[PDB]
Structure 1
């Protein structure tokens, strides 16, 4: 049974990637960056569950950034804040031109961007690989993982054996970076000694996405082929749990930021509507199965049990009842 989106927000163009702000900005609302065909819109999302005063969802676009290229991945910066005294809006966006654009703003007039070049292959995923927000890691189809600072200089380059699909920073432990290669070999790289700490293996191929669990650092989740896969460390490289997620192909894996048992997997934009299957570790079947016409981009709300999938000119929010 298809679940209707709890909240649906109309947009100006197809959303290619939607990302909530996982860091505290100092404001009541949770920031949302959705990147479309030629733009990156920063918005603020206040929900009914967060505040009773809000009826439904209070969606307010704060700042629109002209990108010029299709945004394929967005990474929020730890320094992002909406403090009245000192506002800072920093985020890194990769595009379909193998380039990283760091947009630094103050929410008032000042708008600065920096093109970082170097990748010879399309960047699939990028994240800020620093607690202070100084470094940005980007993985791509050139079989390389490159660490870039704020000034656009490569600090380190890790040669992968497969196109890097998803890069993720360790929630608590410092200097640990997870790179998920497309052949299923997810590796952990030290950012101090620049050496591969460990290499996990997925039973199925291709590994399309991987995410850490903020609540439980040990639990690592990923989507290889049609089945979702969970690993738990320091135990084994073998999948602990492996159950079918989608019939066609599973594309994006995102852990819940409020619960260590809930995770969402999005189906691949293809013959079927891009379905979302919010699974639960205890329940064999997904707790919520919703359908989005064409959906790309998945992110979880920092405090609420809510996820977002960017559909065609729309934003679909699904609330998972805990």
Structure 2
């Protein structure tokens, strides 16, 4: 008997539709509130979130839907453009989605009448992950079950294609490096590509398979974190191709891994969606056990707030937020 005291979510917001993915804007939108996107069965909702921890005028959470986009298909992944700004004389909302129809859609909006989307075709399998290039915002990387990593301009033209040895499961741009791309493969291989040389720089191998998610630490560009099988795995580059840490994350497989955007020692993992509840575990590298354990009904997405030690997971028709101490 240790009653796993599953912590309640710090905040909970009701949604009009099922949440299948959720992503905070990791960029500065120039607004006081953090931009959040969530994808449902046929819609993408863009919202502003303000928290009492960043703004003493808010009691708890202020959640405001800014815009709802008709998407027509189930959204699987969302990526923010670094050009997204709401405080400008001309606000620009730009994000990309991957969906159940194997297409990418780039949405561009002024929050007024100008609402345009571009459809990008070329993936022959499901797209598992997609990301904008952070610093230029001009390019989108995507990975999928067609065993390709593809690079697109905003015009939907394929600039580059890398053939993978298995399904691509996650993709991340180097936080400081416009031409460095991490691609994580389902067989446990994580590869780094240079887009100027079109070459693989280096690879990492997971001690478990399948690898389901990987993330590049923004606060420490030497750290890579992933989930594979039941474990979370951390590497510190360039010191070794072997993992520095490998520890149990979840009993019934780990699904998502994300680094905190404010702390290089904090990350969250999600369990595979069981029939009733997904477990969420917040970890700190100085501790052998999770510092927080939460639960969501059918956990979908995992994202971190830009400034606060606050993570979000979608579940059923709700967003669940967990704040951790720093």
TM class by shorter-chain length? over 0.9
1:114 aligns to what? 118
Report how far residue 272 of structure 1 moved: 5.4
CA shift digits 1:143-168 (9 cap, x unpaired): 00000000010011000001000000
Work out the CA distance in 2 between the residues paired with 1:33 and 1:273: 22
CA shift digits 1:67-95 (9 cap, x unpaired): 00000000000100002412000000000
Work out the CA distance in 1 between the residues paired with 2:102 and 2:65: 27
Query: Alignment partner of 1:97: what SS?
Result: coil
Any conservation in 2 of the 1:130–1:136 contact (CA below 8 Å)?
A: no
Work out the CA distance in 2 between the residues paired with 1:200 and 1:54: 44
Report how far residue 14 of structure 1 moved: 1.1
**Aligned with residue 201 of structure 1, among 198, 205, 221:** 205
Any conservation in 1 of the 2:171–2:184 contact (CA below 8 Å)?
A: yes
Change in Cα spacing, 1:213 to 1:185, as seen in structure 2 (3 Å) is same
Report how far residue 302 of structure 1 moved: 0.4
Query: Alignment partner of 2:28: what SS?
Result: coil
Work out the CA distance in 2 between the residues paired with 1:129 and 1:257: 17
Report how far residue 271 of structure 1 moved: 4.0
Any conservation in 1 of the 2:133–2:178 contact (CA below 8 Å)?
A: no
**Aligned with residue 45 of structure 2, among 35, 38, 41:** 41
Work out the CA distance in 2 between the residues paired with 1:260 and 1:183: 26
Report how far residue 43 of structure 1 moved: 0.3
Report how far residue 220 of structure 1 moved: 0.5
Aligned length: 322
Unaligned runs of 5+ in 1: none
- TM-score normalised by the chain length of structure 1: 0.99
Report how far residue 173 of structure 1 moved: 2.6
**Aligned with residue 150 of structure 1, among 150, 154, 171:** 154
Matched, 1:30 2:30: no
CA shift digits 1:110-156 (9 cap, x unpaired): 10001100000000000012522110000000000000000010011
Work out the CA distance in 1 between the residues paired with 2:165 and 2:298: 31
Any conservation in 2 of the 1:251–1:266 contact (CA below 8 Å)?
A: yes
Report how far residue 191 of structure 1 moved: 1.1
CA shift digits 1:182-229 (9 cap, x unpaired): 000000011111111111100100000000111111011000010000
2:243 aligns to what? 239
CA shift digits 1:9-37 (9 cap, x unpaired): 00011100000000001100000000011
Query: Alignment partner of 1:82: what SS?
Result: coil
- TM-score normalised by the chain length of structure 2: 0.98
CA shift digits 1:253-283 (9 cap, x unpaired): 0000110111000011014510101111011
Work out the CA distance in 2 between the residues paired with 1:219 and 1:78: 22
Work out the CA distance in 2 between the residues paired with 1:271 and 1:126: 27
Unaligned runs of 5+ in 2: none
Work out the CA distance in 2 between the residues paired with 1:121 and 1:222: 23
Any conservation in 1 of the 2:258–2:302 contact (CA below 8 Å)?
A: yes
Paired residues for 1:1-322 under 5 Å: 1-271=5-275, 273-322=277-326
Which has the larger displacement, 129-138 or 6-15?
Answer: 129-138
Report how far residue 174 of structure 1 moved: 3.0
Work out the CA distance in 2 between the residues paired with 1:116 and 1:184: 28
Change in Cα spacing, 1:232 to 1:170, as seen in structure 2 (3 Å) is same
Work out the CA distance in 1 between the residues paired with 2:319 and 2:166: 32
Work out the CA distance in 1 between the residues paired with 2:48 and 2:293: 26
Report how far residue 96 of structure 1 moved: 0.5
